[PDB]
Design a protein around this ligand. Sequence first.
Ligand SMILES: O=C(c1cc(Cl)c(O)c(Cl)c1)N1CS(=O)(=O)c2ccccc21
Length: 435
Amino acid sequence: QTMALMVSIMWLCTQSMLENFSAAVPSHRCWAPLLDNSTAQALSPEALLAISIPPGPNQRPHQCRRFRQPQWQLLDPNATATSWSEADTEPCVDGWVYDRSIFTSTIVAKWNLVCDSHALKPMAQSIYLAGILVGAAACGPASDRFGRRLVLTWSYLQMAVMGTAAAFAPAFPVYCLFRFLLAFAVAGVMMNTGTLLMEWTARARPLVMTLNSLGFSFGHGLTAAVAYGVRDWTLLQLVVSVPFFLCFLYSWWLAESGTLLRMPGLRFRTCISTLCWFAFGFTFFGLALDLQALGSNIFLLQMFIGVVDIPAKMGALLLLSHLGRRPTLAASLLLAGLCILANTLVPHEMGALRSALAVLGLGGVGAAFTCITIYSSELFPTVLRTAVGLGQMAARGGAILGPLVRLLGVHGPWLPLLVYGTVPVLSGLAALLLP
Ligand SMILES: O=C(c1cc(Cl)c(O)c(Cl)c1)N1CS(=O)(=O)c2ccccc21
């Protein structure tokens, strides 16, 4: 049934977007004696925070440095500001405390993802996407040998097990391994769902496709409410993985009640298709995992993303039927690129406009994915149609490289978004030359 696959892809969407909320970084500072000790520390907590922690980014108290001694010189206005020396600070060693207003417990606040380990969250996303790649590369022969239903049930069981395991992970490497196995099973489910929806009915192939995307969509759209309802990441992952335990009931139908010629042949079409897939995967998995910086409210941002991505990718099929395949694809790619570029061009004070631009860019990359996945079925004849698998592998590689460019935020907060806006523009300019 199509409804079962839609529910499955919606829950896989919740599992995928779980990383955007469980790895959210709140405003943090490390333990200070004049702010977290007993009453003897004294009134005016802002003055205590100012004299105990030097200023930092965005004219805020430094989230990564603490004063070893209380600097009373900055509190009295008669003295010159920024008079403290660098030697008076200590490397924020006494452990970090986090704001429990928005999120009560996250993977950043649990394992102390701080300056020295700030690359762990993008490294965790990269490990997840590498697990996705390994699963997509491995479950192929497994599905061809052991059957699609058996590997589907095994992947569902693995998703459930790894979800319940990562919900209670005591260490960071163990959590990374759990996420790697969960991503392996996610990729297995993805491959099986794609292989089944490609040939269950198909003329109706574009309709079925539009459909699994209206899918991941209703998804991010429902995962925002789930993240808003459950403030603890452990119980959040638990209640996200329980639906997979429920879907495991359909195992065994209720108990019975090669192709390397894609590179030399059509090399131009092959490289262009792989470039578009790489660009889409890169942009999507680089933007959909850092929504905290793209908007002011992550939940409202995701809800707006979904409610605007529904009609865009709905009319994407009308555009494909009326205007063609290449023109609408190039137009959507250029629109997404221009939106992500204007997201950096606009100042950060226009939060609503930044959120709107991010939503428009995500809708554009979704429409571009729809266009390219409809066009890949006609770029190559039946003899060459594993070009689709090669494009999928290229998109997975782009997804993997996605979080790796986010490390450039030290050189500037706009560089990752600058790349996320520049890559789709070049992708559309290259796809414009398609026949
Ligand atoms: O990862 C993939 C993916 C990769 C390949 Cl190679 C595929 O063939 C397919 Cl169908 C999906 N995503 C991530 S997503 O947000 O679910 C999402 C939403 C909409 C379209 C694709 C897609």
